[PDB]
Design an enzyme around this catalytic site. Sequence first.
Site, short mmCIF file in Angstrom:
data_model
loop_
_atom_site.label_atom_id
_atom_site.label_comp_id
_atom_site.label_asym_id
_atom_site.label_seq_id
_atom_site.Cartn_x
_atom_site.Cartn_y
_atom_site.Cartn_z
N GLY A 197 2.63 3.99 10.09
CA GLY A 197 3.85 4.68 10.45
C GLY A 197 4.76 3.57 10.94
O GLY A 197 5.95 3.75 11.17
N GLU A 203 0.61 -8.47 -0.28
CA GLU A 203 0.85 -7.14 0.34
C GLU A 203 2.30 -6.71 0.38
O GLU A 203 2.71 -5.95 1.24
CB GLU A 203 0.28 -7.10 1.77
CG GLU A 203 -0.07 -5.67 2.33
CD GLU A 203 -0.89 -4.76 1.38
OE1 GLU A 203 -1.77 -5.26 0.62
OE2 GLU A 203 -0.64 -3.52 1.42
N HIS A 257 0.74 -1.21 0.00
CA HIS A 257 0.00 0.00 0.00
C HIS A 257 0.79 1.30 0.00
O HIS A 257 0.21 2.38 -0.02
CB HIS A 257 -1.03 -0.04 1.08
CG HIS A 257 -0.46 -0.17 2.44
ND1 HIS A 257 -0.23 -1.40 3.04
CD2 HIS A 257 -0.11 0.76 3.34
CE1 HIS A 257 0.21 -1.21 4.26
NE2 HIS A 257 0.30 0.09 4.47
N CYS A 265 4.18 0.80 9.27
CA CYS A 265 4.16 -0.04 8.10
C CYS A 265 5.53 -0.14 7.50
O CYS A 265 6.23 0.84 7.45
CB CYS A 265 3.12 0.44 7.07
SG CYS A 265 1.56 -0.16 7.70
#
Length: 180
Positions: free
Chosen positions: A145, A71, A40, A147
Amino acid sequence: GPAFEFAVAMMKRNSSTVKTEYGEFTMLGIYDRWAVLPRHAKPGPTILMNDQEVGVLDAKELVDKDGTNLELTLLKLNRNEKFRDIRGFLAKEEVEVNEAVLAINTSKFPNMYIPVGQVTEYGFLNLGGTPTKRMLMYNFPTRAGQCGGVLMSTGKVLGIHVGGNGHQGFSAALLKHYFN
Protein backbone atom coordinates in the site's frame (compact mmCIF):
# COMPACT_ATOMS: atom_id res chain seq x y z
CA GLY A 1 11.64 21.26 5.36
CA PRO A 2 13.14 21.52 1.90
CA ALA A 3 12.84 17.81 1.10
CA PHE A 4 9.15 17.81 2.10
CA GLU A 5 8.49 20.96 0.08
CA PHE A 6 10.17 19.29 -2.91
CA ALA A 7 8.22 16.03 -2.38
CA VAL A 8 4.84 17.78 -2.18
CA ALA A 9 5.30 19.67 -5.43
CA MET A 10 6.67 16.51 -7.10
CA MET A 11 3.66 14.41 -6.10
CA LYS A 12 1.23 17.14 -7.06
CA ARG A 13 2.64 17.46 -10.52
CA ASN A 14 3.77 13.96 -11.36
CA SER A 15 2.09 11.32 -9.18
CA SER A 16 -1.15 9.46 -9.45
CA THR A 17 -2.98 6.46 -7.87
CA VAL A 18 -3.17 3.26 -9.91
CA LYS A 19 -5.21 0.14 -9.39
CA THR A 20 -4.32 -3.07 -11.24
CA GLU A 21 -5.75 -6.50 -10.59
CA TYR A 22 -2.81 -6.97 -8.19
CA GLY A 23 -3.46 -3.99 -5.96
CA GLU A 24 -3.31 -0.21 -5.58
CA PHE A 25 -0.06 1.62 -6.03
CA THR A 26 1.39 5.11 -6.24
CA MET A 27 2.52 5.84 -9.81
CA LEU A 28 5.15 8.39 -10.86
CA GLY A 29 5.13 10.05 -14.29
CA ILE A 30 8.65 10.61 -15.58
CA TYR A 31 8.29 12.48 -18.88
CA ASP A 32 5.94 12.60 -21.92
CA ARG A 33 3.52 9.65 -21.33
CA TRP A 34 5.99 7.35 -19.56
CA ALA A 35 5.41 6.47 -15.88
CA VAL A 36 6.84 3.86 -13.48
CA LEU A 37 5.26 1.31 -11.20
CA PRO A 38 6.76 -1.42 -9.05
CA ARG A 39 7.04 -4.57 -11.18
CA HIS A 40 4.72 -6.53 -9.00
CA ALA A 41 1.80 -4.23 -9.81
CA LYS A 42 1.70 -6.31 -13.09
CA PRO A 43 -0.28 -3.72 -15.04
CA GLY A 44 -2.45 -5.10 -17.81
CA PRO A 45 -3.54 -3.57 -21.13
CA THR A 46 -5.48 -1.02 -19.05
CA ILE A 47 -5.01 0.30 -15.49
CA LEU A 48 -7.25 2.49 -13.37
CA MET A 49 -5.39 5.83 -13.09
CA ASN A 50 -7.13 8.15 -10.65
CA ASP A 51 -10.23 5.98 -11.04
CA GLN A 52 -10.26 6.13 -14.74
CA GLU A 53 -9.45 3.59 -17.30
CA VAL A 54 -6.30 4.44 -19.12
CA GLY A 55 -4.86 2.20 -21.74
CA VAL A 56 -1.28 1.12 -21.46
CA LEU A 57 0.41 1.35 -24.83
CA ASP A 58 3.65 -0.31 -23.82
CA ALA A 59 5.11 -1.73 -20.67
CA LYS A 60 8.65 -2.73 -19.94
CA GLU A 61 9.94 -4.71 -16.94
CA LEU A 62 13.36 -3.32 -16.31
CA VAL A 63 16.33 -5.58 -15.89
CA ASP A 64 20.10 -5.05 -15.61
CA LYS A 65 22.78 -6.24 -18.05
CA ASP A 66 22.70 -9.72 -16.55
CA GLY A 67 18.95 -9.93 -16.82
CA THR A 68 18.58 -9.41 -13.07
CA ASN A 69 15.32 -7.93 -11.82
CA LEU A 70 15.22 -4.25 -10.99
CA GLU A 71 11.56 -4.44 -9.88
CA LEU A 72 10.38 -1.57 -12.01
CA THR A 73 7.95 -1.51 -14.88
CA LEU A 74 7.96 1.47 -17.26
CA LEU A 75 4.55 2.17 -18.83
CA LYS A 76 3.60 4.38 -21.81
CA LEU A 77 0.12 5.76 -21.24
CA ASN A 78 -2.68 6.49 -23.69
CA ARG A 79 -3.70 9.97 -22.73
CA ASN A 80 -3.26 13.45 -24.05
CA GLU A 81 -1.52 15.06 -21.13
CA LYS A 82 2.29 14.97 -20.95
CA PHE A 83 4.06 14.58 -17.61
CA ARG A 84 6.31 17.33 -16.45
CA ASP A 85 9.83 16.04 -17.34
CA ILE A 86 11.60 15.12 -14.08
CA ARG A 87 14.56 13.33 -15.52
CA GLY A 88 17.02 15.92 -14.34
CA PHE A 89 15.98 15.00 -10.80
CA LEU A 90 17.10 11.36 -11.35
CA ALA A 91 20.67 10.42 -10.49
CA LYS A 92 23.07 8.58 -12.76
CA GLU A 93 23.93 6.11 -10.01
CA GLU A 94 22.38 5.06 -6.66
CA VAL A 95 22.17 7.92 -4.26
CA GLU A 96 22.80 7.50 -0.54
CA VAL A 97 21.29 10.24 1.57
CA ASN A 98 21.19 10.83 5.35
CA GLU A 99 17.60 12.13 5.21
CA ALA A 100 14.94 11.07 2.66
CA VAL A 101 11.16 11.44 2.41
CA LEU A 102 8.87 8.62 1.15
CA ALA A 103 5.65 10.02 -0.46
CA ILE A 104 2.55 7.97 -1.03
CA ASN A 105 -0.54 8.65 -3.00
CA THR A 106 -3.17 5.90 -2.96
CA SER A 107 -6.91 5.81 -2.14
CA LYS A 108 -5.94 4.41 1.25
CA PHE A 109 -2.92 6.70 1.72
CA PRO A 110 -3.70 9.81 -0.25
CA ASN A 111 -1.16 12.57 0.13
CA MET A 112 0.98 11.01 2.81
CA TYR A 113 4.74 11.80 3.47
CA ILE A 114 7.15 9.75 5.63
CA PRO A 115 10.64 10.87 6.77
CA VAL A 116 12.51 7.56 6.57
CA GLY A 117 15.92 8.63 7.71
CA GLN A 118 19.16 7.32 6.20
CA VAL A 119 19.02 5.64 2.83
CA THR A 120 21.82 3.28 1.97
CA GLU A 121 22.84 1.34 -1.05
CA TYR A 122 21.76 -2.07 0.06
CA GLY A 123 22.36 -3.75 -3.24
CA PHE A 124 21.21 -7.31 -3.67
CA LEU A 125 18.06 -8.47 -1.97
CA ASN A 126 16.03 -11.51 -2.70
CA LEU A 127 12.62 -9.86 -2.99
CA GLY A 128 9.49 -11.95 -2.84
CA GLY A 129 11.73 -14.83 -3.83
CA THR A 130 13.61 -13.00 -6.60
CA PRO A 131 17.21 -11.68 -6.71
CA THR A 132 16.93 -7.95 -7.17
CA LYS A 133 19.59 -5.32 -7.52
CA ARG A 134 20.02 -1.60 -7.06
CA MET A 135 17.94 -1.55 -3.83
CA LEU A 136 18.09 1.48 -1.55
CA MET A 137 17.33 0.58 2.07
CA TYR A 138 15.80 2.57 4.85
CA ASN A 139 14.83 1.49 8.35
CA PHE A 140 11.01 1.95 8.56
CA PRO A 141 8.16 -0.43 9.46
CA THR A 142 7.00 -0.14 5.87
CA ARG A 143 3.89 -1.97 4.47
CA ALA A 144 2.22 -2.81 1.17
CA GLY A 145 0.00 0.00 0.00
CA GLN A 146 3.20 1.95 0.16
CA CYS A 147 4.41 0.22 -2.90
CA GLY A 148 5.22 2.66 -5.64
CA GLY A 149 5.79 5.32 -3.03
CA VAL A 150 8.29 7.92 -4.25
CA LEU A 151 11.58 8.18 -2.29
CA MET A 152 13.05 11.72 -2.44
CA SER A 153 15.50 14.18 -0.92
CA THR A 154 15.81 17.85 -1.72
CA GLY A 155 15.94 18.26 -5.49
CA LYS A 156 16.35 14.50 -5.94
CA VAL A 157 14.00 11.65 -6.90
CA LEU A 158 15.88 8.63 -5.56
CA GLY A 159 13.64 5.63 -6.22
CA ILE A 160 10.23 3.87 -5.98
CA HIS A 161 9.17 1.79 -2.97
CA VAL A 162 8.94 -1.88 -3.92
CA GLY A 163 9.01 -3.93 -0.80
CA GLY A 164 9.89 -4.39 2.83
CA ASN A 165 10.45 -7.13 5.39
CA GLY A 166 8.35 -5.59 8.09
CA HIS A 167 11.32 -3.67 9.50
CA GLN A 168 13.23 -2.12 6.56
CA GLY A 169 11.70 -0.84 3.31
CA PHE A 170 13.39 -0.99 -0.06
CA SER A 171 13.22 1.17 -3.15
CA ALA A 172 14.31 0.39 -6.65
CA ALA A 173 16.78 3.18 -7.55
CA LEU A 174 15.41 5.39 -10.31
CA LEU A 175 18.31 5.90 -12.63
CA LYS A 176 18.55 8.38 -15.39
CA HIS A 177 19.53 5.84 -17.99
CA TYR A 178 16.34 3.89 -17.68
CA PHE A 179 14.50 6.76 -19.48
CA ASN A 180 17.15 7.64 -22.07
